[PDB]
Amino acid sequence: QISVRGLAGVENVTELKKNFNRHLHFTLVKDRNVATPRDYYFALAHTVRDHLVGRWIRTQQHYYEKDPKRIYYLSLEFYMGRTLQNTMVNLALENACDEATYQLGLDMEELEEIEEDAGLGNGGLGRLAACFLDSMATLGLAAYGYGIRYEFGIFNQKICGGWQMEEADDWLRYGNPWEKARPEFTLPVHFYGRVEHTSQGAKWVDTQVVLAMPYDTPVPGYRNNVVNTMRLWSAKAPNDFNLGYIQAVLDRNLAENISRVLYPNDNFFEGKELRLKQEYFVVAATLQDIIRRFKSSTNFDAFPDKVAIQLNDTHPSLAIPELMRVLVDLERLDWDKAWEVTVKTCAYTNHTVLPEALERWPVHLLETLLPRHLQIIYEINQRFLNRVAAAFPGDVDRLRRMSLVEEGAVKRINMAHLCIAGSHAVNGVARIHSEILKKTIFKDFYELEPHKFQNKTNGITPRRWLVLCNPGLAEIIAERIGEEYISDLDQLRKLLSYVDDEAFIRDVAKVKQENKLKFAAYLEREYKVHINPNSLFDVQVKRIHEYKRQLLNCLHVITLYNRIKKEPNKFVVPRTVMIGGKAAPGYHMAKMIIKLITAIGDVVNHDPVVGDRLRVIFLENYRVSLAEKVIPAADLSEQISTAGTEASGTGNMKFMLNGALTIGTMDGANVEMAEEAGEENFFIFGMRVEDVDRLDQRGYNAQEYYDRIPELRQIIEQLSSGFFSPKQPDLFKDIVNMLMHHDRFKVFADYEEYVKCQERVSALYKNPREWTRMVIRNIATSGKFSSDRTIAQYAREIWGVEPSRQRLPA
Amino acid sequence: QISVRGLAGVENVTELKKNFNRHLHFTLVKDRNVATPRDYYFALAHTVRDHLVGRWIRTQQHYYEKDPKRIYYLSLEFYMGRTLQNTMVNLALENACDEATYQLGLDMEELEEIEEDAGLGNGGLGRLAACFLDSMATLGLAAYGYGIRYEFGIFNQKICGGWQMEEADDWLRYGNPWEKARPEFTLPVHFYGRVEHTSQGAKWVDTQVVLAMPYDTPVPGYRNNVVNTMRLWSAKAPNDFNLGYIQAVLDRNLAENISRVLYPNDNFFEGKELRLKQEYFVVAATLQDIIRRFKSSTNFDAFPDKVAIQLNDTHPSLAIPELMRVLVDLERLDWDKAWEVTVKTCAYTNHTVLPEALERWPVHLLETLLPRHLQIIYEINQRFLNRVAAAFPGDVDRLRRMSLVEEGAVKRINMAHLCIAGSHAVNGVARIHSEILKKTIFKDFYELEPHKFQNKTNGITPRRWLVLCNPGLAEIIAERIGEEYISDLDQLRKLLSYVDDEAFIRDVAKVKQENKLKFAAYLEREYKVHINPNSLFDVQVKRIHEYKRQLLNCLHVITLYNRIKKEPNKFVVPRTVMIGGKAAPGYHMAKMIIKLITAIGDVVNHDPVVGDRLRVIFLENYRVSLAEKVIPAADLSEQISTAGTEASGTGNMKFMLNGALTIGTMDGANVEMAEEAGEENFFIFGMRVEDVDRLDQRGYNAQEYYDRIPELRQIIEQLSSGFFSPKQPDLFKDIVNMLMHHDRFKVFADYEEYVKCQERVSALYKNPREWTRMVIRNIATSGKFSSDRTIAQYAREIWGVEPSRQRLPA
Numbered sequence A, B: 001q002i003s004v005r006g007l008a009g010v011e012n013v014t015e016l017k018k019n020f021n022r023h024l025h026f027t028l029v030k031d032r033n034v035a036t037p038r039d040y041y042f043a044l045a046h047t048v049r050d051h052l053v054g055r056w057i058r059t060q061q062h063y064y065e066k067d068p069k070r071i072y073y074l075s076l077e078f079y080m081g082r083t084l085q086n087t088m089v090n091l092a093l094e095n096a097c098d099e100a101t102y103q104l105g106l107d108m109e110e111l112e113e114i115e116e117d118a119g120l121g122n123g124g125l126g127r128l129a130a131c132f133l134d135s136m137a138t139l140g141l142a143a144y145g146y147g148i149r150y151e152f153g154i155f156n157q158k159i160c161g162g163w164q165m166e167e168a169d170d171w172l173r174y175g176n177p178w179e180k181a182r183p184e185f186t187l188p189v190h191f192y193g194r195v196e197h198t199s200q201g202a203k204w205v206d207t208q209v210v211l212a213m214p215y216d217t218p219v220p221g222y223r224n225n226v227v228n229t230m231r232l233w234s235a236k237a238p239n240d241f242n243l244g245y246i247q248a249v250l251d252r253n254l255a256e257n258i259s260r261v262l263y264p265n266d267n268f269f270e271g272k273e274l275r276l277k278q279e280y281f282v283v284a285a286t287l288q289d290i291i292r293r294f295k296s297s298t299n300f301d302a303f304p305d306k307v308a309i310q311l312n313d314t315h316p317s318l319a320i321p322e323l324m325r326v327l328v329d330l331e332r333l334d335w336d337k338a339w340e341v342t343v344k345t346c347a348y349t350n351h352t353v354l355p356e357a358l359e360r361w362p363v364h365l366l367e368t369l370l371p372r373h374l375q376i377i378y379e380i381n382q383r384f385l386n387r388v389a390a391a392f393p394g395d396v397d398r399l400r401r402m403s404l405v406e407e408g409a410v411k412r413i414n415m416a417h418l419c420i421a422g423s424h425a426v427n428g429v430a431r432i433h434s435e436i437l438k439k440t441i442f443k444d445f446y447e448l449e450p451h452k453f454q455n456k457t458n459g460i461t462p463r464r465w466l467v468l469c470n471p472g473l474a475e476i477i478a479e480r481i482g483e484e485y486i487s488d489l490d491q492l493r494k495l496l497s498y499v500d501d502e503a504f505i506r507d508v509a510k511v512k513q514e515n516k517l518k519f520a521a522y523l524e525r526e527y528k529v530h531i532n533p534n535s536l537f538d539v540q541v542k543r544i545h546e547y548k549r550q551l552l553n554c555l556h557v558i559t560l561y562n563r564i565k566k567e568p569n570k571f572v573v574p575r576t577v578m579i580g581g582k583a584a585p586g587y588h589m590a591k592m593i594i595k596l597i598t599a600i601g602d603v604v605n606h607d608p609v610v611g612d613r614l615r616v617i618f619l620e621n622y623r624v625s626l627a628e629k630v631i632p633a634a635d636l637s638e639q640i641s642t643a644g645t646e647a648s649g650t651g652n653m654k655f656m657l658n659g660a661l662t663i664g665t666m667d668g669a670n671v672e673m674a675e676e677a678g679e680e681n682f683f684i685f686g687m688r689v690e691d692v693d694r695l696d697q698r699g700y701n702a703q704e705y706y707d708r709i710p711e712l713r714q715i716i717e718q719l720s721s722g723f724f725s726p727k728q729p730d731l732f733k734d735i736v737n738m739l740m741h742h743d744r745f746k747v748f749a750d751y752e753e754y755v756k757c758q759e760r761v762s763a764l765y766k767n768p769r770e771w772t773r774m775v776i777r778n779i780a781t782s783g784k785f786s787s788d789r790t791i792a793q794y795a796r797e798i799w800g801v802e803p804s805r806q807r808l809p810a
Ligand SMILES: O=c1cc(-c2ccccc2)oc2cc(O)cc(O)c12
Pocket: A265, A266, A267, A268, A354, A356, A357, A546, A547, A584, A585, A586, A587, A588
């Protein structure tokens, strides 16, 4: 139908149809008489998968022959979403498959909706890993994603009586056609035991063994015939495990629990033993695989020339002492040489400055689970602190500040400190964030080793986040400037010359309207909720957090409602306010915020005086597949974290690419987005980082704002008195108390500027032509935020490898 | 190479080769450069599986169209073994695949050895179910095997220091290419809860739900294009199961433990809750499937006309009250009508008279787990006992003897009594066994309902147990009488006219020698054990039991050794005595017997004076695949259970078909085997059932035999004094004590006749021509013992269906 979706050739369509029928018959063991939509989905998935394997085999053969430097991206999370459409897009098969299925009497879009998300992540960190894999393949790097194959991903969120309920994400129930089990490459991982010192070094003995079984998933590059691998480890008990008889077999579950479930925490550290086991499991299995592949190329001098290991946050930090363990205890290298190799191999990406997200593991846990690693960590610490003492003589407090070992009630190991010590490169994820690292939390480390500290501003893949989710926009862009921008997003700048083009303005606005209509239709069909498609779509989708300030959004919503009630017959720009996202199951305040949002909807959506001028909807079960639906439909993107708290954000970039305007604080990547688009084309409000610092030195008193802002006072009175919860008057007492007395994120301080700024948004929306012109200026300058740009910078400045757009032979 | 293995056509070989390469590439994601023997096995398995599916789909379509009466074979065990060669044989693909693999540079026999046994059974009972499935498909019956997909089958047996060690049979580790998961047909099963009585009947409420997910395996008939289904249920937790968060997800294992492991007990009842859950799980899921299929044909009058349910032992006995529950509580039928339907639908096969194998479930377990079923069982009992009282007025002890409820310290339900009450047909598994049932343990029930009681002598499939495991013998038979005997084993009688044929005598003896050479080679390669291929191969393979009397064999072995030591320079017929089989992990005496056998080998195999005249070998890890190797190699088959204890035996039939002579008591099917072959062609010894009864009335005193038999005395002295265990002199005290004071199976009483009979075996073996002539008379009269005969009798006399040899269109 549309150009960017590829060609539908006669030979191709015929071949796809016959292979579809072959899989339905031989693979699924069905005939057309009993086949369900799900069977049809699987037949198509297997048909498309066939096209990958030839390219997959030859790519990996190519790497074996050429022996390039290998990039190993270690992450506890890979938030992949659905795979079918992505694979079709990257293989240029979308139109041919659409035609083939059409001729078989099937609707491909209906089949696409059957696939479960691979929800092996919490949010931003896991989705960044997924975009990175896509860009690494597109840029022709010999890259491998390594993680854990969780049996259960991020929970499915149900809303019951306005409250979040959690249910298991049984994503593998019907099978996963994309993965290939590799039981032949199973590796042992050791836990517990004790350290024996001999004449020839230390030995780790009397351990318990868990097997790590790999499952490989293909990662196709964009139309370059490159297919890289994501290898995810699954936990298996050895066959002599605990070997009365029946109980011993049943107890195998204990070992296999390691890969059972993803911890559902976003930017929060939970110091549980199972989590530590997960972290070592991925690291130990992965490093064996790396060393095996390196030896199959004695001399570990060339190790850093052939291997790069990227640590996605501190979660895989145990790679540092594990690599030391293998090199010193098993390969018999001297400490100094092993350390040189380790430092030159490892690089670390920091994702947040927030204290509650920082991994600080109790010594007593490491002592029991990983006794040899603790000894190695102690030795690293001593040698590192000797360097600090020599560089800064007499500075005793610096020594305590920089130690990997934190003294206190319970001794802990600071994993971020471990990562900096054992990595040649440390990066933040946006310019402001990287500067904060050097100025605040890692200031001491920066003073010792300034050369280690870098910036790599985050990005998103334009394949999933434009071509896939918004084909209508991709097409009208391609009509003007060609197709090359899909792997060279900087070309979008060419759209600046169309800002006064009357045809383009109309087309951009048309695509947005169609997207809004399609999303409004989705809401009625799947959730029976009614929304006005002519209203401004005001959306905030992201994990529920105090720092992300869904609460500030709530206060604006109530302000709008109160203003309408005061002057019912005054015209206001109609809005649909949509808020979605999951709360960590144990995060009480976040769960209260979800209840607040639904409670506001209950009042606002049923007030006859409001009509269709204001609607508040909670978007249930926010996940990658839902993001692909709502983001193209958005008019206004809410990026309103307290300045200095959101390291980068990536949702912000997704909205910018898809024709929404942004209301936001000068936080994370918002700063660079405003810089690229021009501040006149961005709705910036509120405190800057410097203003927050000034307020902190003075002391934040929320009462001051309550006393001086009558509109804010009314809202707090409504919340406290039970306006939004008549049958439970004190339901929101926890929220009010937090706001008034212990608000670390200064919601009240940004309220006035936020409300004022929102008025300017409504004013612009009244002028459709000028709204759309500003949109064009945003889309046109979104190029910097391609993960292709990000990965090219990692490649050149950290990994020491050169990206390539050259095709492999098909 | 050989005729019975089919044709190797030019078109077929070319097509097999190309599909082999297709699967290696697209299915396994490998190329020839990195592929291992295991990869090659899987590529072949997938290639052969392809040939099944067309036939599988059309068979099941045929049943839907014709709507014949359906046979449901319910078993907790299906001892399937390997599937690759069996599938090739039944599809006439063996020679073509042999050719195709040969041209690819592969040895098919090497590839066959890679497949794991599907060891979902303990021994005879589970293997009977497997042979039955094969015969039902071969006879064109619309039959379904229903059971449990155990994650772990019967344990792998290792011998360490002469003792049995158990390890988990992780049979699914590399995947199972034969099964097809059917998650779309998942069904709920209920446990616990309570019974509420309403105005409209009883209701079972507040239950816990476990999901039953079916996996289907094709069962091909012999060259008739019929492919039936074996459906095995797997346990799955519902997604809201226990839904802090992490623990709730981990606790899903508790529900899924139901299908985790096969109870490793052979002819022994262990009254554990997990086992009861397994029994209800299979019954509840299966019955829903049956009723669904029946409705998709209100009127349950025709239910017995369209459905037969066969209970393999009492393990699935809960089918009776479950069917009543569904008909009364859910379909709202009156009790009397529901009962009439149930009785006419269900039939029960008894497998043993031994008291310790009889299922007697504590009432308190059923009360908690299945409260509604207990109420139904009580009601069945009351109505049944009212019939007994009316038939036998005043006979108060009969009422207590016949009750389904057994009073005592703990009240129990006798499941055998439940089965007889609720079945229209009850059968034993050999003539002597069926007569014992009517005379002894079920005498009361026979007096009330004589028409219910039948015999169905067991059998074995000649496909697996001749054509597959012994192609050399199958070929020389086919050369004389054609191929029709493979599905009409009675035709073997035609071989009686070749008993004086000098060419046939030579060929029969040649095939045996080749088999012995091949097995002697297997032993050296896989276990590094040396055996003399010119010796008499004396084998006893079966589960280790007191009743099966491996101990009597041990006593003969020691007698032979002592006799050689007394007269070293006297000629004796050289023997290799092989004993193999698993012991239940908790069965102390059986574990002691294994140790005894190895302990005897340790002395005998290393005595220089013995030389190669006597060797004692314990065959490790006896299972279906090993049976297929050792049985064709056997000269002498040991079937030496105490008269009245082995209900039938099936191993006996396997040896008879494969050219071994039998030494045995008049027990189980041995009686009918001797009747068929003629007693002159069988080595019969020892007490008959009548002699055991006489000894029991008198009282068995083992001391009498010890005192009167000097050779027996010597052995007991050797055992007690530590001749076979010098470093642990009293190691075998438990065995000696049992033999002397509490031997329920009268080992000493059959000793003299056994030893005498063994001398006659050695005498015959000295005359190769006369040995072989007797062998021919055994093979020629083994026809009755085909499971095709057995199944035809079930079909005509129990199920009310007519078997068919007619081909379905290919
Ligand atoms: O997931 C959480 C995130 C934060 C949290 C709070 C402020 C800044 C960053 C993270 O706090 C928590 C507190 C809890 O008791 C339980 C939780 O699961 C969380």
